[PDB]
Amino acid sequence: IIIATKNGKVRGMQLTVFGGTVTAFLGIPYAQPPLGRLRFKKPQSLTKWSDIWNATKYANSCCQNIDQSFPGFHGSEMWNPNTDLSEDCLYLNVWIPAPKPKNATVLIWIYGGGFQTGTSSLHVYDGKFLARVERVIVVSMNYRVGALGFLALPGNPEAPGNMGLFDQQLALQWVQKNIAAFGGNPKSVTLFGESAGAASVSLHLLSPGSHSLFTRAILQSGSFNAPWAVTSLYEARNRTLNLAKLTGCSRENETEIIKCLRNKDPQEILLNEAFVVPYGTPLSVNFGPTVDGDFLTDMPDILLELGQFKKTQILVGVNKDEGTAFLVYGAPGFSKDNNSIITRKEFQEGLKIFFPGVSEFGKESILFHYTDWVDDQRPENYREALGDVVGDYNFICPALEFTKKFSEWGNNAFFYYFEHRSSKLPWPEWMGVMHGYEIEFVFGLPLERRDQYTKAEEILSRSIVKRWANFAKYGNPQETQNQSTSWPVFKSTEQKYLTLNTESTRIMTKLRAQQCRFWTSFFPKV
Ligand SMILES: *[C@@H]1O[C@H](CO[C@@H]2O[C@@H](C)[C@@H](O)[C@@H](O)[C@@H]2O)[C@@H](O[C@@H]2O[C@H](CO)[C@@H](O[C@@H]3O[C@H](CO)[C@@H](O)[C@H](O)[C@@H]3O)[C@H](O)[C@H]2NC(C)=O)[C@H](O)[C@H]1NC(C)=O
Ligand SMILES: *[C@@H]1O[C@H](CO[C@@H]2O[C@@H](C)[C@@H](O)[C@@H](O)[C@@H]2O)[C@@H](O[C@@H]2O[C@H](CO)[C@@H](O)[C@H](O)[C@H]2NC(C)=O)[C@H](O)[C@H]1NC(C)=O
Ligand SMILES: *[C@@H]1O[C@H](CO[C@@H]2O[C@@H](C)[C@@H](O)[C@@H](O)[C@@H]2O)[C@@H](O[C@@H]2O[C@H](CO)[C@@H](O)[C@H](O)[C@H]2NC(C)=O)[C@H](O)[C@H]1NC(C)=O
Ligand SMILES: *C(=O)N(C)c1cccc2c(CN(C)CCC3CCCCCC3)c[nH]c12
Ligand SMILES: *[C@@H]1O[C@H](CO[C@@H]2O[C@@H](C)[C@@H](O)[C@@H](O)[C@@H]2O)[C@@H](O)[C@H](O)[C@H]1NC(C)=O
Ligand SMILES: *[C@@H]1O[C@H](CO[C@@H]2O[C@@H](C)[C@@H](O)[C@@H](O)[C@@H]2O)[C@@H](O)[C@H](O)[C@H]1NC(C)=O
Ligand SMILES: CC(=O)N[C@H]1[C@H]([C@H](O)[C@H](O)CO)O[C@@](O)(C(=O)O)C[C@@H]1O
Ligand SMILES: *[C@@H]1O[C@H](CO)[C@@H](O)[C@H](O)[C@H]1NC(C)=O
Numbered sequence: 001i002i003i004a005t006k007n008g009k010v011r012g013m014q015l016t017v018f019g020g021t022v023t024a025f026l027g028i029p030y031a032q033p034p035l036g037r038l039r040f041k042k043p044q045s046l047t048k049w050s051d052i053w054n055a056t057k058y059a060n061s062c063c064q065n066i067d068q069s070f071p072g073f074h075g076s077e078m079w080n081p082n083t084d085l086s087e088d089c090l091y092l093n094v095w096i097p098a099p100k101p102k103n104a105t106v107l108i109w110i111y112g113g114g115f116q117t118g119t120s121s122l123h124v125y126d127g128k129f130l131a132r133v134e135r136v137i138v139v140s141m142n143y144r145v146g147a148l149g150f151l152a153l154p155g156n157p158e159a160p161g162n163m164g165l166f167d168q169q170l171a172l173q174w175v176q177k178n179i180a181a182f183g184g185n186p187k188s189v190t191l192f193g194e195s196a197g198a199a200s201v202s203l204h205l206l207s208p209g210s211h212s213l214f215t216r217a218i219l220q221s222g223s224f225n226a227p228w229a230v231t232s233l234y235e236a237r238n239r240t241l242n243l244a245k246l247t248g249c250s251r252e253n254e255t256e257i258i259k260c261l262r263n264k265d266p267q268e269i270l271l272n273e274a275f276v277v278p279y280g281t282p283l284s285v286n287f288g289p290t291v292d293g294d295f296l297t298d299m300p301d302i303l304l305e306l307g308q309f310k311k312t313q314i315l316v317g318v319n320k321d322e323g324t325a326f327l328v329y330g331a332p333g334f335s336k337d338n339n340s341i342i343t344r345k346e347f348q349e350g351l352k353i354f355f356p357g358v359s360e361f362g363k364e365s366i367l368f369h370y371t372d373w374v375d376d377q378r379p380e381n382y383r384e385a386l387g388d389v390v391g392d393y394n395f396i397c398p399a400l401e402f403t404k405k406f407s408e409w410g411n412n413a414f415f416y417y418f419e420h421r422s423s424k425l426p427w428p429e430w431m432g433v434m435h436g437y438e439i440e441f442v443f444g445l446p447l448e449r450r451d452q453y454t455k456a457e458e459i460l461s462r463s464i465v466k467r468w469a470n471f472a473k474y475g476n477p478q479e480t481q482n483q484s485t486s487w488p489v490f491k492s493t494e495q496k497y498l499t500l501n502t503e504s505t506r507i508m509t510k511l512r513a514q515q516c517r518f519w520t521s522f523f524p525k526v
Helices: 128-134 146-150 163-182 196-206 208-213 233-246 254-263 266-276 300-305 344-354 360-370 381-407 455-474 513-525
Strands: 002-005 008-011 013-017 020-029 052-054 091-098 104-110 137-141 184-194 216-220 314-319 413-418 496-500 507-509
Touching (some): 104 455, 128 455, 163 184, 163 208, 300 381, 381 413
Parallel strands (some): 104 137, 184 216, 314 413
Antiparallel strands (some): 002 008, 020 091, 091 137
C-alpha cells in the first residue's frame, strides 16, 4: 500500500497482528538531515522528492553514547539503540489500522533517555498493537539527543539550543500536514512520552509554536519541573565551553567555536560529552532543554505558575519504585546481582552521589526526613530509603506539583500510580516497580499471548490501553464497559489518583504527601 504525502509518495508494509493487519510506515524522513553546516542548527524543511520512498525498515537512530554498565544484560541493553547510529536520523514512523481508518485519533510517542539517548525503534515502543486493538494511528519520531541535539549558546542560531525539541516540533508539524492522507485526524492528536519524552511533552504544552500541533498530552514518569529536566543557561554556557576545550575548539568568536565543532567527527563530540559536567550523577543531563527565547520564551517554572500554557486535558503518572533503577549506576553498596543491603554510612555516601552540589545541611535534612523508621532493625531500611529519596525527588513530587499547578487553571487532569512489576522483569526484586517498565503495558505487549506474560498482565495491559485510547479520543481515561473503577479528575484540593495494578484499581488521595512537602517546600531553599 502506497500513500501520497505533501513531499512525495511513501511505501509501507503489511504486518500480521492478532489475526488482523496493521500497515506500518517505518522511517519516513521529516527534515533535511542535519549534517555539515546544519549540525547544531534547527531542523530545516524537507525538499520534495519525486520517487517512492520505501518506508519498510526503521531508520538510523541519532548519535548517542551507549549504556555499557551491564554488557549482555537485557535489562539495560533493551534501551540501547537497535539501528545504526547516524547524524542522518530525522525520521518518523506511522502505524495505521487495516482497513485504513476514516478519521482515527493520532497518538504521537516521544521517547525518553535523559535527552542524551533513546530511539523510536525500540521493541517496547512498537505501535502496531495500539493500532490493531484500538484503531488509533501511532506516530513516533527520532529527535537529536546529547550535544548534537541540545548544545546551547543562546541567542546564536548556529547553536541556539533545544534543536531536538524543534526536531520533535517539526514532526508534530509533519503529522498536521500529512496524517489525513493516512486516515488520521490532525484535530485529534495526543502526545505521550516517558521520562525525557514526558518532560518534552510538558514543554510542548508550554511552547506557543506547539500549541496548534496537538490536542491533549500524556506524561509518564516525567515533567519539565523535574530537577534533571532543564539545563540552566549558566551551565549550558559552562558546558558548551568545556566541550569546546575538550575538543580543541576554544575560540573567542562564539560562532567560530561552533564552526570548529562542526568539523569534528560525531564520535569525538560524543566521547567528550560525558566529562563536560564537574560532578555527574546517574541522572545527569549534560545537554538538555534551555530557555532559548524561541521554543521556551521564559523560565518554565514561571510559565507554569502563571498559567502560560495550552489549556487542555492531561494524563500524568509515576511508578511505585522510580528511583531504584538509578542506584545501581553509582550508589555504593548497590548491585543488581545482590540484595543491596546498605548501611547508614553507605546511604549517606549515596546522598553525596545523587546530590553532589548540595550543602552538608541539605544532605542531613534529606537523611533526617527519610530515616525515622517504623522499625529501625529492618536491614533493608536504608536501601529502600535511598530509592525513595531518588524517586520522590526526581519523579513523583515534580509530577504531582506539575499536575497541581496545571489543574489549578481549570483543566481536567488525571493522575495514576503504577504499582505492577512485570512478571518477566530481568532486574532484581528489590528494585520493585521500576522506572520505565509501565511502557510495555501502555504499548500492549502483554496482549501478545506468545510472550509469556501472565493472564492478569494481559488484562491489565488491556485495561490500560483502553484508558489511554479513550483519553486520546475523548479526553476521559475511563474503561466504561468491564465495570472498571471510575478514574476521577485530579483536583488541587482532594488530589485523587488511580492505582494501576493487577489486583485492585483503587482511588487514593494525596500521594506521598509528607515526602513531597519536604521536597517541594523545604528542599528548594537549600
Ligand atoms: C474528522 O473529524 C474532525 C472532527 O474531529 C473532532 O473535533 C476536534 C475539535 C477534536 O475534539 C477531535 O478529538 C474530534 O474527534 C472533522 O473536523 C471538521 O472539519 C470540518 C472542516 O474540515 C469543519 O467544518 C466546519 O464547517 C463550518 C460550517 O460549514 C465552518 O464554518 C467551519 O469553518 C468549519 O470548516 C468541522 O467543524 C470540523 N468538526 C469539528 C467537530 O471540529 C473532520 O471533518 C473529519 N474528517 C473526516 C474525513 O471525517
Ligand atoms: C565551570 O567550568 C569550570 C571548568 O571545568 C573544567 O574544565 C572542563 C574542560 C571539564 O573538563 C571539567 O570537567 C573541568 O572541571 C569548572 O572548574 C572546575 O571545577 C572543579 C570543581 O568543581 C575543579 O576540580 C576543577 O579543577 C576546575 N577546573 C577548572 C579548569 O577550573 C567549574 O566547576 C564549572 N562549574 C561551576 C559551577 O563553576
Ligand atoms: C553487593 O555487591 C556490591 C558490588 O560488588 C560487586 O558485586 C558483587 C555482587 C561481587 O561480585 C563483587 O565482587 C563486586 O565487586 C558490594 O559492594 C562492594 O563491597 C566491597 C567490600 O566487599 C567494597 O570494597 C566495594 O567497594 C563495593 N562496591 C561497590 C560498588 O560499592 C556489596 O558489598 C554487595 N552487598 C551484598 C549485600 O551482597
Ligand atoms: C528519563 O529520560 N530519565 C529519568 C533520565 C534522565 C537522565 C539520564 C537517563 C538515562 C540513561 N542512563 C543514565 C540510565 C539508563 C537506565 C535507566 C532506567 C531504566 C532501566 C535501566 C537503564 C535513561 N533515562 C534517563
Ligand atoms: C522500493 O521498493 C520497490 C518494491 O519492491 C519491494 O521492496 C524491495 C526492497 C523488495 O523487498 C521487494 O521484494 C518488494 O516488493 C523496489 O522494487 C525498489 O527497488 C525499491 N527502491 C528503493 C530505492 O529502495
Ligand atoms: C473486557 O472483558 C472481555 C472479556 O471479559 C468477558 O466479557 C465481559 C463483558 C464480562 O462478562 C466478563 O465477565 C467476561 O469474562 C475482554 O475480552 C476485553 O478485552 C475486555 N476489555 C477491556 C477494555 O478491558
Ligand atoms: C548508516 C546506515 O544504516 N546506512 C544504510 C545501510 C548500510 O550502509 C548497510 O546495510 C551496510 O551496513 O544500508 C541501507 O542502504 C540498505 O541497504 O537498506 C540503508 C541505510 O541507510
Ligand atoms: C564572528 O564571525 C562571523 C562570521 O563567521 C562574523 O559575522 C561576526 O561578526 C564575528 N564576530 C562576532 C563577535 O560574532
